[PDB]
Each structure stands twice: as C-alpha cells, then as structure tokens.
Design a binder for this molecule. Structure first.
Ligand SMILES: Nc1ncnc2c1ncn2[C@@H]1O[C@H](COP(=O)(O)OP(=O)(O)OP(=O)(O)O)[C@@H](O)[C@H]1O
Ligand SMILES: Nc1ncnc2c1ncn2[C@@H]1O[C@H](COP(=O)(O)OP(=O)(O)OP(=O)(O)O)[C@@H](O)[C@H]1O
Ligand SMILES: Nc1ncnc2c1ncn2[C@@H]1O[C@H](COP(=O)(O)OP(=O)(O)O)[C@@H](O)[C@H]1O
Ligand SMILES: [Mg+2]
Ligand SMILES: [Mg+2]
Ligand SMILES: [Mg+2]
Lengths: 340, 48, 49, 278, 96, 292, 41, 51
C-alpha cells in the first residue's frame, strides 16, 4: 500500500551536467535535475523516462512503448493450414515466395548479379478464389514476425489518429528487423484523391498520402516486406500502383477443369463415402465455379443424407447438390475487373 | 449531471460517465431507493 | 483605382478570405455590409475558361 | 532566466548517418532540371552581388511537380547529399496534431530554428495534405488546417531577403492547390518534371545497366526505339525483373531472352486499337 | 417531408428514431406527414450513387412501423399530389 | 487487524483506466547503503504502465492488489485516486447502443401460425437448430454445417414473420438489428458497432443475429472520380470480414433478409458468407384459404 | 505578357556567362526560346 | 479608471482573484489587414502603360 506511481515523460535535451529539459506526454514542458547514479551517458535526446511526481527529478529510463493496438495485431492467428490445403495454383505460390522468403535467407545471390529485391506485391482476383487462404498459409509456415491488419479498423474519429497509428506500426517493424506487414481489404483506404470531396473525407486522403510517404519517402526500408490483397483493383490511386511501391501484381483466376479436380479432391476427403465416386462428371458440370463453391457442394451432399438417416454418402447426392448450387449462382455479376 | 453505464451484482457498485472527466466507480446515497436506477439514464451526482 | 483613390478590392469566391467576411456566408451580398465602411470602392472580377 | 535556443520537430539531419548518398551520376538525362535547381538554390548563396547589380530579383520559393514516377524525390536526396549548408526535411502531414495549438507552434519553431541556425534549406514533401482549395467551416478539423495554412503563409512572407533561408516544396497533383500559396513573392519558381521521350531513355538504360554483368551480346537499341511512353520508374523495374529471372534458373549472367520476357511482363498493353474507325 | 433532409450523413434516420420515441413516451396520438413524395419514391440505384441518403431515411421510416414488436398505440396520416411514385413497400397494407 | 486495515483503505470512489504495457525489470549494476531506494534496484518482477481516463500516463513500480498473471494489454482496471495503485479488474465494456439490441421479453407465437411455407420453414430449421442440438450427427459424417442464410422475396410475404417465430421457439441468445442503424455520422463510428456486436455475441455459447433490411448497406460499389459515399462502403468492408476472414469463428449464426437482390454487391453473396439463399413465393391459390 | 517574360529571361542568360551587362544576342536568344516554348500548347 | 478610455477590442491586464481591471495594453486586431494581405493586389499607376 505504501507506494506511488511516477509520471511518464520524454527527454528533449541535456542542458548542463544537472539540467535537463523534458516534455511530459500530456502538456507542459519542464526543466528538471537528474539523479546521481543513472549513467547520464544514456539520456540521449529522445529516450522515454519516468519522473518522480513530488519534485520532478529523473528517476529511471525505459524502453520504447508498444501501443496495445500494435501488440494485438502482432500475434493473433489460427496459423495452421499447410500448403497441402491449397490446390490448383502452385505456380502463383512459387512466384510469391520468390520475393517474400528467398531474399531473407540467401542474400548473397542477388549481390552477385547486381540488383535489389522487390519490396512488395499485391494479389487480385474475383471473389472467393482464396486470396486470404494463401496469406494464412504463409503465416503458418515461415518464421519471421507477421503483422496482420484489416485496413478498416485503423480509422478513428479524432483528428490525427490514423496517421499516428501508421507511423507507429512502421516503427515497430523497423525495430524487429525481419518483418512482414500484411494489409487486407486495401481498397477501403486506397481509393482515389477526390477532385471535390467533402470534409468528412479528407482525413482519409491525409492518411493515404502519409502511408505512401513512409513506404517510399526520403528514407529507405531494409528487410521489411509488405503484401496487399484486394477484391477489385480498378479504383486504386495511380500513385500507389507505381512500380516503386508495389512491384509485382499476381492474378488469381477461376479454376481450370484440372484445377477443379484438384480442389474437389480435398474437401471430399474426410466424408464417409462409398468407393464408387467418379469425380470426372462433377468436374464436367462445374463450369465457372469458384473454389469456395466446391466446399458448398461437399456440404449439401451431406445435408441430403442427414435426413433419410443414411450415415454414408453415395454418388447420387453429389449430382443433386451440383445441380442445386448450379442454378443459385444466377444472380451474381460475373465481372472480372482489372488493375490499371 | 452524468450518464450511467452499468451496474454489477450482489453489492451495488456503479459506473458513472461524466462529460469531460473520467469514468468512476461509485455507490448510492441513503435517501434514494436502489430499485429506480435502471441502467443507462441521466443521473445527478455530488461534487466531492 | 489608384488615380481616383478608391479601395480596389477583388473577389473570387474562395474560402480562406470567406471567414473574414462572415462566419459561414450563406448568402452573397454580406460584402456590402463590409464595403460601406470604406465606401469609395471598386469591385473587380475576372473569368478564365 | 532565459534559455539558449531550443526547439523540436525534425532536428537537423545530423549529417553523419543521415546522408542518403546518391551521387549526381545516378541521376541520368535530367540536366535541365539539375542546372536550374542548382542556380535556384546553391548559386544565390554566393553570387548575390551580381543579382543586386543586374537587378534580377532573386527568387525565394520553388515548387516542383509532375506525374508520379519521375524522380522528384531523387533530386531532394541528391541535394541533401551534396549540400554544405544545413538541411531539414519534414513530411507534409505531420503538422496536424490532436492537441489544440500544436500545429501552429510546430510550424513557427521550425522556421525559427531554420532562421537562427544557418543558411539552411527546408524541404516539405507532398504538400497536398495541407494546402487545398475548398474548406468547410463547421467541422473543426478544417479550422485547425486553416490556422496552419494561414500562419505558414504569414511567416514565409515575413522574411527580409537577408537571412538566406530557402524552401523546397514538392507535390503530386498540382490541380488542387490554393493559388494564394503560389502568389508572386512566395513561391517564385515552378519546375515541371515530364516523362522521358527518346533522349533520356537511352541514358537511363546505359546508367542503370552498368551494374549487371549483362552478358556481352545483348542489344539495347531494340528497346529504346519502341514506342510506349513508359515512365522513368519502369526502366528500373525492367532491369530488376530481368535480373531476377536470370537468378531463378541458377545462371549468373543475364541473356537477351531475359530482357524480352521482362519487357513483356512490365508493359502489359493489350491492343486498345479498335480498327474499323480508322 | 422537406424538414427531413439534413446536412450530414445519418442525421435523418436519427430524427425519425427520436420522433417515434417521443411519440411512444406519451400515451397515444397522431402523426401527420405532408408532401411525402419528397422523401421516398423508389430504389433505382445505377452508376454513381443517387438519392442514397434519402433512401436510407425512407427505409428507417418504413422499418419503424413493421417487424419486431411494433409501435402499438400510434396512428399515422399522410397526403400527396402525385402518388404514382410512392414505393411498393411503403404502400403495402399493414402500413397504409 | 491486518485484513481490516486493508479493507478500510478500499474506499470505493475509484478512478478507472486502461493498462498500456507490462514490463520486465532488472536491478541496476551497482548498489549503495545509507541512501538506497527500494524501487530502483531491488525490484525483480513485473511492472506496468497505465493510461488514466483524464489522459495521464503513469508508470507503476508495484502492481498492487492483483496478480500480474491475469492482466494483458487493453484490460480495464479500477484504480485508487491518490496513489494510482491498482485495486480491481472490472468486467469488460460494451457500447450502450449494443446492449439495447438484445431481446429479453420473448415474442410469442407458434410454427402453426404460418400458412403456406412448409418447405422454407424446414430449410431454415435444418440449417439453424440442428447444428446447435445435434453436433454429433454432423461430426460422424465428417462435414461442416452450413454457415448463415439469406431470405428474400416480394414484400407482402412472411420474411420477418418467420424470424419472429424462430426467436420465439429457440433458446439461444438472440440479437435484433436493422440495416440503417449501422450508419453513423462521425467517421469510423460504425465499424466500432459492428465489431462490438459480434464481440458480444461470441461471449455467449449459442447465438443468432438478424440483419434486417440489409440493402441499406450492401449497395454495390462503384468507380467515382468526382464525389461519392465512400463511408458506408467502408463499413460494409468491415462486415464482410467479420463474417468470413482471418480467424474464422463458429459460434455465431447469421440470418439476413431483403426484398431486393439485384442491387447487392457480389462479394456479399459469395458462397462462404451467405450460405443458403432461400426465396419466398407469392402465395398460391390454396394458401390464401389458410391465411384467412 | 510575353515581353515582360523575355526581359526577365534575358538577364539569366547574362548570369550564366558571368557578365555584367546584357548584349543584344542575349535578347534574340531569349526571343527564340520564348517562341519555342509557346509553340507547344 | 474612466469608462470612456475602455474602448472595444482592447487588450487589458486583469488581477488574479477579484478579476478587476488594472491597466491597458496597446495591441489590437483587425480583419481587413488579414484579407488584403492574403490577396496581394499589385498597386501601380499610369506610368507603365504602352499603347
Ligand atoms: N485452391 C483452393 N483450394 C482449396 N480451398 C480453396 C481454394 N481456393 C479457395 N478455397 C476456399 O476458399 C474459402 C475461403 O476463401 P478466402 O477466405 O481466401 O477468400 P477470398 O477467395 O480471398 O475472397 P474474399 O475474401 O474476397 O471474399 C475456403 O473455405 C477454401 O475452402
Ligand atoms: N534519371 C532518372 N529519371 C527518372 N527516374 C529515375 C532516374 N534514375 C532513376 N530513376 C528511378 O525513378 C524512381 C524515382 O523515385 P522517386 O520515389 O523519387 O519518384 P517520384 O517521381 O518522386 O515519385 P513520388 O512522388 O511517388 O515519390 C526510382 O525508383 C529510381 O530508380
Ligand atoms: N401465413 C402468412 N404468410 C405471410 N404473411 C403473413 C401470414 N400470416 C400473416 N402474415 C402477415 O404478413 C406480415 C409480415 O410482414 P413481412 O411481409 O414479413 O415484412 P417484410 O415486408 O419485411 O417481409 C404480417 O402482417 C403478418 O400479419
Ligand atoms: Mg479476404
Ligand atoms: Mg517522392
Ligand atoms: Mg422486414
């Protein structure tokens, strides 16, 4: 019970051997004297420090903070899907891992040819093909810190909070050197600079141009990589798509028939079925389905058996389900879209 | 004048939100019954 | 305007100077309420494109 | 008591581990802009007497602009490396602050430090954030932005042509800017950064490819003569991509097929040439 | 109806909520709406957004009369000049 | 006496405040007597940094009357006014609007009081009740239950009546919500309600949340160069992701309803988000006897 | 408006050559440069 | 102090607790100076006309 807190603050400069200027985080600047033992060699301009409140003297120095938002988006993940669970686009996986891992290890190769590896890439394709699954697959496998944000929670109603958060997370990436920022649903913020706009908007344009400035302005990243994923890449600002910022654009499409076989084999795995199933016909009908639809096929084929009390599936229910889903997708738009 | 946020069980303990100061944990005074402080309505609290 | 000694003022309907004229400027002619204190004046405007 | 001058913000560009170190050689083909920024900034430091004698009204502020991907920031890097006087850089959207009154203070002290320190240069990058045409005087956030813009203009206008303080300001879209900033007497020079045409593309290729082994028989004239008006930040991506293509197959010398596939990879223009109109 | 167009986004809906709430506070009485056809006609969205905000206002007004424990002891009363533009979901009985 | 001396300190007018950080602390290299501090060196456990409501930030050298194991950044704790010692951990908080959108006096009906829909009622109950009372029946077969349903059709039909009956017969926690209720004036005030609603509904084991009149929100995105209503789109892009993205959930069931379907964005109709799409007819010549 | 331009620019040409007065050929070079820059748009 | 000297839009010192007036300060603020300085119109005369 007989204890007291201490005020937090930040040092601006050492004035003499016993005079320091500090700024509290909340407001008024001050002039304050040190405690004798603290190794004054360490109070460089900028370090955080703790002041005694009754008389304001330096009492201890501290490490940099991490704001709880960055902590939370530091390490929440189911984080366990293998590359085994992704079928039908191994080629894109090779294309991507040739940027986000092969130059973290093995840096001696590139300096032999004479180039600098890319900084970041983006993924795009029509809904439901798996742009998110691939990123979870990455986050499971390889061992470097991995920040994971949904590009829509980082907005707040006060004046300059958004740009502050973006600067703080790029700092936290600079401290811990091998890091990967993943920025999901980016079209929420990438937008385009309006010619007219409205007051409630221009906050977002500030934040955007701030992000661009940290991604390439009068500074240089090393060992930070970022990858960005979006559902529709037409409405992206022409500055953010400059090759300096996002180097490679990777297209994810609707599955080829061979790919449909590959994908369907998986989600058909664990079902208690009977050994007479011909996947080739189901492939034959599934023209223009996304990957996310075949999971649905494998679900309905079970639903038709939960009634009628069969605890085993048989090949007729797959036909039923395929035609039942085939006619429900007659109300989506089927526009592909293209970044340009 | 302030706005109340919620309560909690078995022993009245209340959360008070004021307009520009902090949120507090408070109780009642004797002259007012504990039934009619249904959650989420304006209340008047003393200054000490 | 200089040779006849009139307070030569120009208006382009911008927003920096709007606050000086009034709080919101819902209507337009509020500048008259500011021009009469300096009556010998010339209003000048220009059109591009 | 009084204090020796003290401030905040960007401190100084401390000049030891801060020079980004890009020689003038790494910039190719931009001789026009190089020479005129040089005579706009570094020459008035010395040849002021000539200006007074001839009567040419030395310029004070300079603003440079153009389409994205033409190396506006590379000149700022080059100057900051080669300068001798003090240099300061800030980000345009850092002045806004939650606490009331911190923005105006952060501007006035930046100017004060630049004044009292030395013949310095301020650099503000991507100023579209602050100076814009329209406003809404009911939301408050516009109120803070108004105060910032007003007093910045005021204090830039308060100099006496003696303290040799220059300002370098850059932007992306020049359309949405309040003309009141580019009024004569404040930002007297405008610099346009176009796209390479024919003369600069060859120079950029010749400078960039000096680092790669690049085989011996590769031909570059086959690529400069093509027409496609690519930017200046695509040549770099072309060379980088061909290099990576060579690394993939474990060969450490880049060949012509690499350049071919890389060029096709970068450009991506289908036809857009609907024919029966012609 | 023209009193229900507001400056900022989401204001009209709030106004409709507290209008019906203040009505609920009392025992029971009448609400008269005039010149409806200014506040909601139909939903025809195409290209750039058009009348979206007014449409959200209309939806909130609709919702206040139907679905999940309705208002009870409140009667409305409307009028118009060209009623062909009224929306089908508004003219459905149970509301009019 | 010792426990009473503790008790008589705890006067309830605490402040409230948020934990910002938890730190690992190590004594200094050198020591002294005649003048040593208990707190600089000679501490070895955890320490904390807290943010008060009145925008102070305090370092704490000694945590106080709560075991450091159970704290994590973002926790909400009640704190003594003078010392700023920590005294209690409070229940987490949910926005005052959200706590309003929960049913608590049940609607009262019966499935008998709907005429002419015997197939859609089955299609719903099979996809909402059983995955809540008969898990093993899906486990044995090696399958994942259908994930949330959309009901649509011309206006004068049973769309909402059914949801009312469903809430009347189930026993899960039931949340009622309306489309335009998620639009708010200040930027980013909406998404905070979306994610608070889901957060509260997963702190209860079986829960259903009913998004009425969704076409206020799901309106198709568009390319616009002059001006547009980017705001509500930017809250939809939260709903989409709360419903199916990183960290998949399983304990919340979603129902949604609308009477227009050509408007909605294709990314909201994907197979993973709105799973079964079922549609209501204009009542046939036989039902119209039953309704009357 | 271009005459003021040519007078402004003719000084820079003497500036480059480190002279103290402005010769006539400087004027004509400035004239041609103004014509040329106007010939584009 | 006399009231007449107490002009509108004037800076004045003011004691701490009673908040009573005590002295006078010269500086004052006006709108037109700020608007005209924003505009920056070029004053001239007949001398520069040609044709
Ligand atoms: N190649 C694939 N192999 C297996 N499953 C796949 C594949 N492609 C997609 N899926 C399925 O996609 C479903 C979810 O896809 P995901 O969450 O990545 O969304 P998305 O396709 O990126 O679209 P959006 O987020 O824009 O709605 C998973 O249930 C997974 O079964
Ligand atoms: N001579 C040159 N001209 C143009 N670009 C060049 C030249 N030499 C190199 N580049 C390349 O052009 C790019 C310019 O980078 P930089 O970020 O400065 O561009 P910018 O035009 O200022 O864009 P932004 O406004 O988006 O920052 C670099 O990637 C660099 O490799
Ligand atoms: N068997 C029935 N089928 C359809 N509607 C019914 C039936 N019985 C009553 N109704 C009436 O239909 C209305 C239901 O409203 P509803 O149309 O579902 O709202 P919405 O237009 O949002 O769908 C109620 O007034 C209810 O009295
Ligand atoms: Mg996704
Ligand atoms: Mg730049
Ligand atoms: Mg309804």
């Amino acid at each position: 019970l007989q204890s007291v807190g201490q005020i937090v603050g930040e040092v601006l400069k050492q004035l003499t051997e016993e005079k320091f200027i500090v700024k509290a985080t909340n407001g008024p600047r001050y002039v304050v004297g040190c405690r004798r033992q603290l190794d004054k060699s360490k109070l460089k301009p900028g370090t955080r420090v703790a002041l005694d409140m009754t008389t304001l003297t330096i009492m201890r120095y501290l490490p940099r903070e991490v704001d709880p938002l960055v902590y939370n988006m530091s390490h929440e993940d189911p984080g366990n899907v293998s590359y085994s669970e992704i079928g039908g686009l191994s080629e894109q996986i090779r294309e991507l891992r040739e940027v986000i891992e092969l130059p973290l290890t093995n840096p001696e190769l590139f300096q032999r040819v004479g180039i600098i590896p890319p900084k970041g890439c983006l993924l795009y394709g029509p809904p439901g093909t798996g742009k998110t699954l691939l990123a979870r697959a990455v986050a499971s496998q390889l061992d470097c810190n991995f920040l994971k944000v949904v590009s829509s929670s980082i907005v707040d109603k006060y004046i300059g909070e958004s740009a502050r958060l973006i600067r703080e997370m790029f700092n936290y990436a600079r401290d811990h050197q091998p890091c990967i920022i993943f920025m999901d649903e980016i079209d929420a913020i990438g937008g385009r600079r309006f010619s007219e706009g409205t007051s409630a908007d221009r906050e977002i344009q500030r934040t955007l141009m701030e992000l661009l400035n940290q991604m390439d302005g009068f500074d240089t990243l090393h060992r930070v990589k970022m990858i960005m994923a979006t559902n529709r890449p037409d409405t992206l600002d022409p500055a953010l798509l400059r090759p300096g910022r996002l180097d490679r654009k990777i297209h994810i499409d609707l599955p080829n028939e061979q790919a449909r076989l590959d994908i369907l084999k998986i989600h058909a795995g664990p079902i208690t079925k009977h050994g007479e199933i011909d996947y080739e016909a189901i492939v034959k009908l599934s023209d223009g389905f996304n990957g996310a639809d075949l999971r649905n096929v494998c679900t309905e084929a079970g639903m038709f058996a939960i009634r009628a009390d069969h605890d085993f599936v048989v090949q007729e229910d797959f036909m039923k389900a395929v035609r039942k889903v085939a006619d429900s997708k007659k109300l989506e738009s089927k526009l592909d879209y293209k970044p340009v | 004048c302030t706005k109340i946020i919620n309560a909690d069980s078995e022993d009245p303990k209340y959360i008070i939100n004021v307009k520009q100061f902090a949120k507090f944990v408070v109780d009642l005074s004797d002259q007012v019954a504990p039934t009619d402080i249904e959650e989420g309505m304006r209340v008047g609290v003393d200054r000490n | 305007a200089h040779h006849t000694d009139c307070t030569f003022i120009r208006v382009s309907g911008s927003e920096l100077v709007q606050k000086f004229i009034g709080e919101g400027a819902r209507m337009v002619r509020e500048l008259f309420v500011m021009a009469r204190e300096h009556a010998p004046s010339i209003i000048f405007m220009d059109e591009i494109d | 008591d009084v204090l020796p001058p003290e401030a905040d913000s960007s401190i100084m560009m401390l000049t030891s581990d801060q020079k980004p170190d890009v020689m003038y050689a790494d910039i190719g083909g931009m001789d026009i802009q190089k020479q005129e920024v040089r005579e706009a900034v570094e020459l008035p430091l010395t040849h002021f007497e000539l200006y007074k004698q001839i009567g040419i009204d030395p310029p004070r502020g300079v603003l440079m602009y153009g389409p994205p991907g033409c190396g506006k920031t590379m000149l700022a890097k080059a100057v900051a490396h080669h300068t001798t006087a003090a240099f300061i850089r800030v980000v345009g959207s850092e002045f806004v602050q939650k606490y009331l009154g911190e923005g105006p203070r952060m501007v006035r002290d930046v100017f004060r430090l630049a004044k009292e320190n030395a013949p310095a240069i301020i650099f503000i990058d991507e100023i579209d954030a602050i100076a814009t045409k329209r406003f809404d005087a009911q939301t408050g956030a516009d109120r803070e932005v108004q105060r910032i813009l007003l007093e910045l203009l005021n204090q830039m206008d308060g100099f006496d042509q003696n303290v040799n303080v220059k300002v370098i300001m850059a932007t992306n879209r020049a359309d949405t800017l309040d003309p009141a900033l580019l009024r004569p007497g404040r930002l007297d020079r405008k610099i346009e950064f176009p796209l390479p045409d024919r003369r600069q593309k060859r120079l950029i290729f010749s400078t960039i490819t000096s680092k790669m082994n690049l085989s011996e028989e590769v031909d570059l004239e086959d690529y400069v003569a093509r027409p496609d008006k690519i930017s200046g930040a695509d040549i770099n991506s072309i060379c980088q991509e061909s290099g990576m293509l060579a690394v993939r197959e474990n060969r450490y010398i880049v060949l012509a097929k690499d350049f071919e596939k890389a060029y096709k990879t970068v450009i991506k223009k289908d036809e857009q040439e609907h024919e029966f109109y012609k | 109806g023209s009193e229900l167009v507001q400056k900022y986004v989401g204001e009209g809906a709030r106004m409709v909520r507290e209008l019906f709430e203040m009505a609920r506070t009392k025992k029971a009485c009448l609400i008269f709406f005039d010149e409806i056809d200014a506040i909601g006609g139909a939903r025809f969205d195409d290209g750039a957004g058009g009348d979206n905000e007014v449409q959200r206002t209309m939806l909130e007004l609709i919702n206040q009369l139907d679905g999940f424990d309705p208002r009870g002891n409140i009667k409305v009363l409307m009028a118009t000049n060209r009623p062909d533009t009224l929306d089908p979901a508004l003219m459905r009985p149970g509301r009019l | 006496e010792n426990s009473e001396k503790i008790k008589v300190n705890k006067t309830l007018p605490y402040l409230v405040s948020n934990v910002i950080e938890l730190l690992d602390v190590d004594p200094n290299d050198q020591e002294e007597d005649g003048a040593n501090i208990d707190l600089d060196s000679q501490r070895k456990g955890k320490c904390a940094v807290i943010k008060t409501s009145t925008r102070q930030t305090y370092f704490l050298p000694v945590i106080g009357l709560v075991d450091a194991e159970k704290l994590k950044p973002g926790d909400l704790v009640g704190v003594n006014k003078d010392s700023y010692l920590i005294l209690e951990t409070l229940p987490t908080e949910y926005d005052s609007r959200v706590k309003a959108m929960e049913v608590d006096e049940r609607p009262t009906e019966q499935y008998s009081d709907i005429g002419g829909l015997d197939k859609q009622i089955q299609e719903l109950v099979e996809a909402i009740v059983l995955p809540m009372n008969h898990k093993e029946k899906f486990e044995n077969l090696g399958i994942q239950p259908p994930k949330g349903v959309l009901m649509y059709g011309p206006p004068g039909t049973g769309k909402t009546l059914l949801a009312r009956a469903c809430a009347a017969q189930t026993k899960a926690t039931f949340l009622k919500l309306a489309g335009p209720q998620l639009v708010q004036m200040f930027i980013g005030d909406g998404a905070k309600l979306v994610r608070d609603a889901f957060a509260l509904a997963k702190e209860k084991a079986p829960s259903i949340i009913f998004i009425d009149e969704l076409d206020a929100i799901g309106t198709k995105r568009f390319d616009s160069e002059k001006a547009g209503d980017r705001e509500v789109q930017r809250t939809m892009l939260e709903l989409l992701n709360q419903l199916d993205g990183f960290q998949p959930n399983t304990q919340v069931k979603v129902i949604a309803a609308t009477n227009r379907v050509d408007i909605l964005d294709p990314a909201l109709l994907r197979s993973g988000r709105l799973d079964r799409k079922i549609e209501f007819p204009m009542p046939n010549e036989e039902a119209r006897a039953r309704i009357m | 408006a271009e005459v003021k331009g040519v007078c402004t620019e003719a000084g820079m040409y003497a500036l480059r050559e480190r002279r103290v007065h402005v010769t006539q050929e400087d004027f004509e070079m400035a004239v041609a440069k103004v014509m040329q820059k106007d010939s584009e748009k | 102090i006399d009231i007449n000297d107490v002009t509108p839009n004037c800076r004045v010192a003011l004691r701490n607790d009673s908040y009573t007036l005590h002295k006078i300060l010269p500086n004052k603020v006006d709108p037109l100076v700020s608007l005209m300085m924003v505009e920056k119109v070029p004053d001239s005369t007949y001398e520069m006309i040609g044709g």
